[PDB]
C-alpha cells in the first residue's frame with residue numbers, strides 16, 4: 132500500500148468498465164487501419180485547437196499469454212528492446228513490486244517541440260468475474276505529479292492515460308500452438324502546448340500500428356520455446 136493505491140484502483144476499474152467494450156458496432160469510432168486481427172481506431176477530438184484523438188486498438192497474438200504480454204509491456208528492463216520513440220527514461224520512484232513512476236522523453240518529431248511525460252505504471256491481475264469468464268491482465272500508464280520531476284527546457288509536458296488489457300484463450304501439456312492473447316490497447320494523450328494538428332495525426336497513424344506490430348512480435352520472439360507463464 133503506497134499513496135496511489137486508490138487512484139490506481141479507480142483507473143484500472145474504469146478501464147475494465149469502459150475500455151474493454153466492443154467497438155465495431157460503434158459508429159463513434161473511426162476504424163483507421165486494419166492489418167489482419169490488428170485493428171486501430173481513433174476519434175477525432177480537439178480541445179482549444181490541440182489534437183487529443185483517443186486511440187483504441189485490438190489485436191490477437193498467437194503463442195503468448197496476457198500475463199506474458201503485460202510483464203513485457205511493464206518491465207522497464209526490456210523497454211529499450213522494443214521502444215523506438217523514446218530518447219531517455221528514468222524511474223523516479225518505486226511504489227511497490229507492481230508499480231513505479233517513470234519519467235521519459237520522446238524523440239522530437241519535426242517541427243513540433245520535444246515532449247516529456249511523467250506517469251505511474253502499474254501491472255495488475257483481475258480475477259475472472261465468474262468461472263465462466265477469462266481472467267485479465269492489465270497495465271495502466273497514467274500521468275501523475277511528482278516533486279522529483281526533471282527540469283527539461285527542451286520539452287513540453289504531455290499527459291497520458293494508456294492501458295494495455297489482455298485476455299488469454301486456450302484451446303486445449305498445453306502448447307504455445309494452442310494459446311491466443313486478445314489485446315485491447317487504449318491511449319488518451321494530451322500533447323500539451325501546441326503542435327500542428329497534421330503532425331500529431333501523422334505521428335499517431337504511423338507510430339501506433341508500428342508499435343503494436345513491433346511490440347507483439349517481440350513478445351512472441353522472447354517467449355517462444357519457454358514454459359508458458361499463464
Ligand SMILES: CCCCCc1ccc(-c2ccc(S(=O)(=O)CCO)cc2)cc1[C@H]1C[C@H]1c1ccccn1
Pocket residue numbers: 216237240243244246248272289291293318320322326330331334335338339342
Ligand atoms: C509532437 C509529438 C508529440 C508526442 C505526443 C506523444 C507523447 C507520448 C506518447 C506515448 C506515451 C506512452 C505510450 S505507452 O504505450 O505508455 C509505452 C511507454 O512509452 C505510448 C505513447 C504518444 C504521443 C503521440 C505521438 C503519438 C505516439 C504514438 C506512439 C509512439 C509515439 N508517439
